[PDB]
Design a protein around this ligand. Sequence first.
Ligand SMILES: Nc1ncnc2c1ncn2[C@@H]1O[C@@H]2CO[P@@](=O)(S)O[C@@H]3[C@H](O)[C@@H](CO[P@@](=O)(S)O[C@H]2[C@H]1O)O[C@H]3n1cnc2c(N)ncnc21
Ligand SMILES: [Ca+2]
Ligand code: NA
Ligand code: NA
Ligand code: NA
Ligand code: NA
Length: 179
Amino acid sequence: FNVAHGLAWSYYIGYLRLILPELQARIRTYNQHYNNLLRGAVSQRLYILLPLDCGVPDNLSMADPNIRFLDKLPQQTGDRAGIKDRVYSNSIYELLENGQRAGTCVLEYATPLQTLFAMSQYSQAGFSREDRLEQAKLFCRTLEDILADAPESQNNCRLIAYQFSLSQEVLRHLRQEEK
Ligand SMILES: Nc1ncnc2c1ncn2[C@@H]1O[C@@H]2CO[P@@](=O)(S)O[C@@H]3[C@H](O)[C@@H](CO[P@@](=O)(S)O[C@H]2[C@H]1O)O[C@H]3n1cnc2c(N)ncnc21
Ligand SMILES: [Ca+2]
Ligand code: NA
Ligand code: NA
Ligand code: NA
Ligand code: NA
């Protein structure tokens, strides 16, 4: 529990709190040159995939061929713990449905889940494969409780937890926001 609790707090403090206040302007800036009457604009929140039991690939097209990379948002830099101009980059994806674009959003996995699942290769990391499955659930619940007590971050991101069409799962959450 304390392994998942710590990773959720680390992710909020060292990542979501730094990028979510600036996310809206970065998206709005991308939508300036990009948005027109012939296409859907990039949606306004960070969609964070929280798979409960997945290998967590680096390429979202590997998870679902209906999720394709479109472009990067303009970068966000800042000095952090001795590192000058540490870079925070986010990617824009199209969500296809029946061969046509149905959604456009900034999407990514919660990186601590990928790292958690990779701890299995190391004997000294401890915890069996069944322990890692409960730590993913505990990471998600903790993060959800954090965002519930942080109204600013709450409206700038959407958690997509799940256990298959990943495109349809993201599209479902994306469609709840508009209508
Ligand atoms: N630029 C970014 N893009 C995307 N997601 C990011 C991110 N910077 C943060 N995060 C997220 O916040 C978490 C906490 O971050 P911290 O920054 S408090 O610390 C991490 C963590 O402790 C460990 C593994 O990190 P990991 O990615 S699995 O976990 C991160 C990650 O999920 O190594 C550190 N770390 C990672 N990348 C860097 C880096 N470029 N320079 C210096 N230290 C780094
Ligand atoms: Ca439009
Ligand atoms: Na940002
Ligand atoms: Na740093
Ligand atoms: Na990117
Ligand atoms: Na978005």
